[PDB]
């Protein structure tokens, strides 16, 4: 019994060529996003229709792999259907796609008002077949991220915030998020309006295993990676302006290390005012106050890093929220 | 509004210091325009990493070696982003036909590195047509 | 003749006196293979990555046809063994055939990796070569 | 108006797609060796059979090369139409060839009873257009040498060397040569039974930077003019001897290494050595003398000329004999 095969794709190309006066006919397929070649038969060639989904069934004869027979599905969609992994290839065609993820880490970015960001960890394959989790970015501003997160209602500022840190470590269905190149490539994600984050809620067995989300890479950075550091001594802050960049030089305590760092000083909606300057001493007071709140356990701080993996001390801050014995969480 | 001032006097004293050495929206980059006039050499190639087009051609000063990282924009649950690949891969190594018959001529758009130049990559295309059309890549 | 018949302790090889500083390892393909035509400055080559127990390797083949006359066999019998490598993967997966890949490594440098030849292994007997 | 473009090829295969409900239609061609895709219509889709020839005239419409009209030539041979250039494609195809080459040098290899290497400057190009000039190898028995030289008569292998060294540096049409490619790729020539060698009595760079048969290194002959040295050393590694010799220019040091053909079952390997350091310890004695004058072919990496091997040296004699080792 010759053994035979069955798989779904679409028609992509089909090629015809002659080898020594002996007719071949190649059907360029598209199977699980890859592209496969299948021998087929003169008849095959004429009754497959480009750009449309056949689910085939193939054979193993004559060290080949034959067309033997074929039926049409039409146009399967899977949105709102969960994949365990995407692939580099849906990054390119930027695909709107609903896929399982892991979310890591929140805040909004330093200088901005209504702009925020969260870090996810995606499992995504490489073209040569193996999945690796990478750690992957995502920005969309306060209104997107208000109604986009399924069954918990976000009003205010103070609530996003809220529901971002129970949902830490907890893996979300996300549904139809759009992946993305740019100028520099840069593969991230972002919230179109018809977006659901919803949270898996169920830690037990599903798919955390092999522990496949690991995070030694991001696609949304260039060779650094996102690390979350909860503050524990000493916080020191002080001002400076290099020949470069406007900065703040702050160095910090965690249960861990001392981590010395900067923060690139940027302010949005400054229009014919001072007032650049005059929030910065603004948040010139806010970092110096900081040390005092943390050693009186009033707040606690935590630090969202862009740290070099290998040379370790390189770091940017890109944001900083605070969260206060009320309840009530400062970003910065 | 963009009003070309055009040309100025006093301008000797403007292009002295307009001389630039780097690029503010680059990381550690510039961007460079090369007018292509010798052979064009377009391959479809995938690396481990990602989807990219090996690109070589000619100038009137030295021969670059670069690629090109592959994309598309709004290709919605459609198989069009694999053959609209194919499409360039045509365009692509057809562009050598036109140069060497002076029908078209090509405007590469190069972030390149000052220091190390391996770190080739081409950010647009400009085909400059005989029709005064352009058909950008 | 070749008459096949605590020694194994002298045949061991660190250099093969055929090649220079390179030797011989023949490696079975249990995951991923993915091949895909590429053509060099230099050189007509095959970009193959596949994965044995041990790790994944990348590696070459160079492209050539013992004498094929007057004929346009060489692009199409080249754009033929592109296909036969583009399912390889498939029949991998379903064991329909097992692969194994002959390789001229360097045992300094992992990098200078160079298939010399490939052999198949089907199920029902037959072994194909390319 | 517009303007078209003529083109004669032969097509390979011919792929067809669709994008946006509309059916698109590629044909592959190989015109001058490059791999092409040219536009065409369902009218053409069968109007043109792979593996066969054709003479097409094509037209840039909409910023696409479409193909205006069609012809065929049936089945071209172009065997004995020598040509400037060679491809690297046409090196893994392993293709008979007439091309023009340049010969160089041209020695018998050392320990062999007959095996005679020529060296030749071909023009070659890389898959991107740049013709360059690199060093070719062609290794060959005396059988075919002798009949291989059109219009020079070889009875001898005394009377070889003579045809070589009044060829050296003339131009030849090469007829009928195979292009090789090896497990170690390694690409060289090698006659047939039904090939010559034409003296030809340019306008290219015919400089070479490079021999395609060996890897980073190259052939060079230097007539030995002064101190010839010369003692046998086995080393850890293998048996060779040991030279040093004089050129106009500078003071060469070097090795060549020691092997025997058709001396099995036989005391003569030891022995013939033994002999050929006779041989060599006396090649200063007639170089001063003026009895002989030498050309040593040697193996020379271009970047260190510290890796330097011997493959051949030929001895010249006043009478007209010639005596290679």
Do not use: W
């Given at each position: 019994?010759l053994?035979?095969?069955?798989?779904?794709?679409?028609?992509?190309?089909?090629?015809?060529?002659?080898?020594?006066?002996?007719?071949?006919?190649?059907?360029?397929?598209?199977?699980?996003?890859?592209?496969?070649?299948?021998?087929?038969?003169?008849?095959?060639?004429?009754?497959?229709?480009?750009?449309?989904?056949?689910?085939?069934?193939?054979?193993?004869?004559?060290?080949?792999?034959?067309?033997?027979?074929?039926?049409?599905?039409?146009?399967?969609?899977?949105?709102?259907?969960?994949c365990?992994?995407?692939?580099?290839?849906?990054?390119?065609?930027?695909?709107?796609?609903?896929?399982?993820?892991?979310?890591?880490?929140g805040?909004?970015?330093?200088?901005?008002?209504?702009?925020?960001?969260?870090?996810?960890?995606?499992?995504?394959?490489?073209?040569?077949?193996?999945?690796?989790?990478v750690?992957?970015?995502?920005?969309?501003?306060?209104?997107?991220?208000?109604?986009?997160?399924?069954?918990?209602?976000?009003?205010?500022?103070?609530?996003?915030?809220?529901?971002?840190?129970?949902?830490?470590?907890?893996?979300?269905?996300?549904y139809?998020?759009?992946?993305?190149?740019?100028?520099?490539?840069?593969?991230?994600?972002?919230?179109?309006?018809?977006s659901?984050?919803?949270?898996?809620?169920?830690?037990?067995?599903?798919?955390?295993?092999?522990?496949?989300?690991?995070?030694?890479?991001?696609?949304?950075?260039?060779?650094?990676?996102?690390?979350?550091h909860r503050?524990?001594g000493?916080?020191?802050?002080?001002?400076?302006?290099?020949?470069?960049?406007?900065?703040?030089?702050?160095?910090?305590?965690?249960?861990?290390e001392?981590?010395?760092?900067?923060?690139?000083?940027?302010?949005?909606?400054?229009?014919?005012?001072?007032?650049?300057?005059?929030?910065?001493?603004?948040?010139?007071?806010?970092?110096?106050?900081?040390?005092?709140?943390?050693?009186?356990?009033?707040?606690?701080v935590?630090?969202?890093?862009?740290?070099?993996?290998?040379?370790?001390?390189?770091?940017?801050?890109?944001?900083?929220?605070k969260?206060?014995?009320?309840?009530?969480?400062?970003?910065?």
């Amino acid at each position: 019994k010759l053994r035979t095969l069955n798989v779904k794709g679409q028609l992509l190309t089909k090629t015809t060529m002659s080898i020594n006066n002996e007719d071949y006919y190649l059907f360029k397929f598209l199977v699980n996003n890859k592209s496969i070649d299948y021998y087929g038969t003169q008849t095959q060639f004429f009754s497959l229709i480009n750009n449309k989904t056949y689910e085939l069934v193939l054979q193993y004869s004559r060290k080949k792999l034959l067309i033997k027979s074929y039926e049409q599905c039409e146009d399967e969609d899977l949105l709102m259907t969960v994949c365990k992994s995407v692939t580099f290839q849906e990054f390119c065609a930027n695909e709107i796609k609903s896929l399982l993820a892991k979310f890591l880490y929140g805040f909004k970015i330093y200088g901005s008002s209504n702009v925020y960001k969260l870090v996810f960890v995606i499992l995504l394959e490489d073209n040569n077949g193996t999945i690796n989790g990478v750690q992957v970015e995502m920005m969309s501003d306060f209104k997107r991220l208000s109604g986009a997160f399924k069954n918990h209602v976000i009003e205010n500022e103070n609530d996003l915030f809220d529901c971002m840190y129970k949902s830490e470590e907890k893996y979300f269905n996300l549904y139809r998020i759009k992946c993305n190149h740019n100028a520099n490539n840069y593969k991230s994600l972002s919230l179109s309006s018809n977006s659901q984050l919803e949270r898996l809620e169920t830690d037990d067995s599903m798919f955390e295993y092999e522990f496949q989300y690991d995070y030694t890479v991001n696609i949304s950075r260039s060779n650094k990676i996102i690390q979350k550091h909860r503050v524990t001594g000493n916080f020191t802050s002080e001002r400076n302006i290099y020949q470069n960049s406007d900065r703040f030089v702050i160095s910090y305590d965690t249960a861990n290390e001392k981590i010395k760092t900067s923060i690139y000083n940027r302010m949005e909606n400054a229009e014919s005012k001072t007032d650049y300057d005059t929030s910065i001493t603004l948040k010139d007071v806010t970092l110096s106050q900081l040390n005092s709140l943390i050693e009186s356990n009033l707040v606690q701080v935590d630090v969202y890093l862009v740290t070099d993996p290998n040379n370790v001390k390189n770091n940017v801050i890109a944001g900083i929220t605070k969260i206060e014995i009320d309840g009530t969480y400062e970003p910065l």
